[PDB]
Design a binder for this molecule. Sequence first.
Ligand code: HEC
Ligand code: HEM
Ligand code: HEM
Lengths: 233, 143, 534, 190, 57, 54, 51
Amino acid sequence: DDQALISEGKDLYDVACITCHGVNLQGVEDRGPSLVGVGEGAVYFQVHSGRMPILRNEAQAERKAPRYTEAQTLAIAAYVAANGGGPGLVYNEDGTLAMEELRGENYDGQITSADVARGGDLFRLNCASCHNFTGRGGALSSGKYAPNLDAANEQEIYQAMLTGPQNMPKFSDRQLSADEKKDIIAFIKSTKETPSPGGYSLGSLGPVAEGLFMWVFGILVLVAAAMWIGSRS
Amino acid sequence: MKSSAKLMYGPTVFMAAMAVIYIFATMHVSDGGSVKGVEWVGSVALVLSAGLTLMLGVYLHFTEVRVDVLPEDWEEAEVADKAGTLGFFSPSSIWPAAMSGAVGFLAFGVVYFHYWMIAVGLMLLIFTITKLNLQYGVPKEKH
Amino acid sequence: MSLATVGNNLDSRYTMASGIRRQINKVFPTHWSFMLGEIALYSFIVLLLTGVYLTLFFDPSITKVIYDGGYLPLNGVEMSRAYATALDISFEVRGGLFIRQMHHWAALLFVVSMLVHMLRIFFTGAFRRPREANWIIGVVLIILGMAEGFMGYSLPDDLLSGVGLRIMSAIIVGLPIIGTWMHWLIFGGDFPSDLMLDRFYIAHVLIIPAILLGLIAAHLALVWYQKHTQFPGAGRTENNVIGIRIMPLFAVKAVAFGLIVFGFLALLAGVTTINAIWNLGPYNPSQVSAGSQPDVYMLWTDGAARVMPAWELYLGNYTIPAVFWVAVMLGILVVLLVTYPFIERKFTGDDAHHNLLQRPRDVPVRTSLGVMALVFYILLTVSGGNDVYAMQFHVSLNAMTWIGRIGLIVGPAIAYFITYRLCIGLQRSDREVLEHGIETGIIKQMPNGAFIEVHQPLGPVDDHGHPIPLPYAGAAVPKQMNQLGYAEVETRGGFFGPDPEDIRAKAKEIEHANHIEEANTLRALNEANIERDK
Amino acid sequence: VAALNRPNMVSVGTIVFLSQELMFFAGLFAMYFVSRANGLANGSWGEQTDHLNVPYALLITVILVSSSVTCQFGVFAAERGDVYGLRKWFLVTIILGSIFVIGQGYEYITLVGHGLTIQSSVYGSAFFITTGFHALHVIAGVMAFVVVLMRIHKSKFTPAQATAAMVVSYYWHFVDVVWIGLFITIYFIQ
Amino acid sequence: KHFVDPAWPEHNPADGHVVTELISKVAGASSPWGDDKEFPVSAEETGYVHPYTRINR
Amino acid sequence: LSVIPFIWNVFKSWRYGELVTVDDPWGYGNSLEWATSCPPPRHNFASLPRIRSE
Amino acid sequence: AARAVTFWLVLGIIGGLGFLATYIFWPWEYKAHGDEGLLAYTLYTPMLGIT
Ligand code: HEC
Ligand code: HEM
Ligand code: HEM
């Protein structure tokens, strides 16, 4: 099954990626890195989230609407895997890519809150420095930034942790084991998918959003009330 | 407003004739170096361009059959004919600049697509437009 | 009724009849500016009461517990007793979250209300003699209000508060003789310390509230003693106040504006989340977030630390760190604000007993310096928040720091230039109206073809048929004809239909009669001022 | 003798503006019809177009034309100098316009409820852009009526306010006309 | 009969009309304060009160 | 480089240029704007000529 | 004028009664992400503060 999939992988690779990665994935001098040994997971992350192709050299690549569908993504990943392998996709017990089954070490049918606690402390330890407390993203040096984690599915999160896309450090499966990674996924999805008890969240950016809101519009409405109650002379 | 009401009939009829000619042409001529078949972009534009000019012309004519022999159109009018009030004109107003800034804020909001910027931009925009339209009718200070 | 008996019994003992008469008859001007300060006062009231409700649940202890409360996503997580009790306020107490958010929003409203009130005082010139004492008191208040609010949000010992506490301690230790000694004095040891949160708790709930309450009491007492300033206007002089008496028509408006601010706070406290501590986790010194700025009113002193170009001195066995210079800068910035009326005196060359306010257009230097300080403060603020700004609006983080650096020099100059020229243009428009009359906007063509705009004079007209210029008086000049009454409705009634015509005519007649009567009384009052001044 | 009858300058201005806006809607029409021309090859159009609800469309069309009728009764009241009749009919028009906005909103909510959005198909994108821009126009028209009511509440009813009411009526009539065009295109000519 | 705002100018419909969607008696826009007015007016008729005021020296 | 004299010429003529006395310094202005003052007044016309041709 | 004042007065009466009802009867205890009744818990503070 994979042997014929690799052919479509090659056909798609020849028509898009050579200009940056070479016919033999060796890379190009300043135009793109070598893809030997990156594996299925890096290709899946890069193509499925739509980061590749990169049509402009920049401080950082951008997520966008993907140029290929799922089957084409797996075909290109199979072709790249044939050149040296690498980290692999997390296949579930039936053979499909794992989605919604990575939400915690002890997932049954709903997010276990103990996993959420451990994953919250893990995310605060490692991930929250570049992203923020709830994964709303953050800034870096010279025009680079850490994206907001609301866009990615669970497989993309796992392969992001595994591969270290551009400036993200790698988190191998022996630094952060599968239980730790799945608890991190559980915490990310819990924070994403739970409404704030205290009303509208103001984006959860912290003091900046709350400040801007009050110190512009909250005081503006009260001076409007004062003008209603007072006089202009 | 007689001459300008009626001179608009040339452009509109020319555009309408070009629209029908073009629709028949692209739907029939199977020339090499091109593909047969009616194209809707362009034809729709031509018919509604004829529509714009026809709307202008017909409204102006429909109005002009009402008005009198204005001295600006009378070929031997004297300067004393138009003596009187010409009309009301705004002396000054800060609100055009304000609502330009409001539209700018809204446009920047849709650039980055921060939803709060879009909402605040629309609110600020209707506020500035309202302040523009009520400028010469705000009530006197109520004691 | 027995109310008379109560009043009799009171006054036969305390003899308050003379005094309370004098109190109720005091006159207060009615400008819209002149209740900005009340907003701050009302916010302070709310700050007190909601704070007192939060103290029945908060436990200011840095010693740990394994959490087992209602917030399931942190069961088993070892956390400080402060953080655990804040979580129990948020989740285990009915409506404690509502209250905690109201306390925080009240803090933000309090500080910004002080800021805008102070801006009014600065621009209108109300700080001048004899009232500069109220400036020296007031500036101290707006310092302490921030100092309190900072340590107020430091108490829960969450991850976002402890980093600010870390920053404060690390700034204190860097001072060039006594930094280590002052740190060990304040914190009782190295940071984090056992006695830290209890010293800050008592400083937050007892000390600084007591001082703020005393200073606010003195402030309001002084404002009441020497009566409120006023803007120049018809019949107004340096030796009188025109407005309304403190009751019935002013006290009820004060109550009503208190109600409005109170309810506004209760709305925005339930509808917008503020400081969602439950997803920050407890503090431990090894962890940090990308967006970890202090509260909004502290962002300026963050931004200073962001824009200082790392100049550090080494002297043998000693070193002055690079963060000493931001302390010097912020201290200079605070000194300038504290001592402003006297450096205004020394260059303005006057020491008069002003009671009438200056419109900000008429004092271009001071208002230009005020806008200059505003842009300086705003650049400090947004430089403090540039981590978020660069992430959201996609401007490079280095470019934001350099924008802050170079802007704190350049942007103030541009602000001064533009503000000065705009103020001069405003007062030029005022003079243009006062020497040519209002431009109605009605344009008429003469028999010669000349296009003329009929101008509507304010003062008398010379026999040539043109206004005689009036001297500018500092009071606002009307610039349009809708501000003289000429656009007021002639019809009377509600929606969907009119009043009967007899009621209509009689009501309009009484309305116009009153409109001329008030004009007559103000005109006679002004003529009496002229006679009494000679 | 009385003065000449001269053209109403503000009426010429608003008519020129509406003639301009007609070419704004020309672009959306062209995009929709190019989409339809592409789709009719595969027959996929004939499937996606079966998601729509034409009787609900007829009901909201009836509501909007009723809004137009009420608006012009208000205009007759205005030219007679009667402010209260103007207030009556313009408030009724505001109500009907708000009901049309709610009609389109509920249409969208149900449509995303049963499997049509912008991402679902080219039909989804064409349908929603074409109807949503007109929805924004209807919202702006209701806002214009409310601003007119502010004006005639605050100011004395002179000819300057009567022509303002007359001018906003032109915009609302243009909105009704372009709705009729859009309805005939999308629900009938489809 | 219908109500008429008394700010409305008087006219005879039998030989004309006051304003319509198409035509008006002005080249530009009508006065917000009424074309029937005749500006300027007297100082006291204006309703304005000019303040005399002085400041300390 | 060509625009340097243009910018300098506009800047200098605005602030110290030769003053214009007559209504039409070029002499033979045909259009109506050359009958009025230089600059015009606020409302463009202190008097309208008898207009009878182009 | 009497009608205009009494309208806001009755609005305040129903607002305060709605507050007491929401404070007393509205569900207020914590609900996890997967729990039924999460909607009520996530509207408890907003509803009571609104009214
Ligand atoms: C700064 C050194 C980082 C740390 C620590 C972590 N990540 Fe990150 N992440 C970082 C960058 C610069 C980027 C963008 C990469 C790119 O090529 O665009 C990312 C991206 C992710 C993503 C993808 C998000 C998306 O929208 O596709 C995920 C899911 C992600 N990162 C997760 C993640 C986790 C769970 C981390 C802790 C284990 C973590 N990252 C650390 C920078 C940094
Ligand atoms: C919590 C802090 C404060 C409170 C509660 C407060 C309260 C008040 C009140 C109610 C008034 C009278 C009404 C009004 O002017 O609007 C007033 C006036 C005044 N305020 Fe404040 N204020 C505070 C802070 C300040 C600050 C920060 C300054 C200046 C740095 C200041 C200086 C003054 C002065 C000088 C007056 C009198 C001016 C005049 O009489 O016109 N106050 N204050
Ligand atoms: C009687 C006076 C006061 C008391 C008793 C009091 C009490 C408290 C307590 C116990 C806390 C921590 C518990 C919690 O997080 O809910 C707190 C937090 C806070 N206080 Fe106060 N306070 C008082 C006055 C003030 C003042 C005057 C200000 C502002 C100048 C202020 C600003 C804050 C802020 C911003 C917080 C953080 C709120 C949060 O993080 O949820 N407080 N207060």
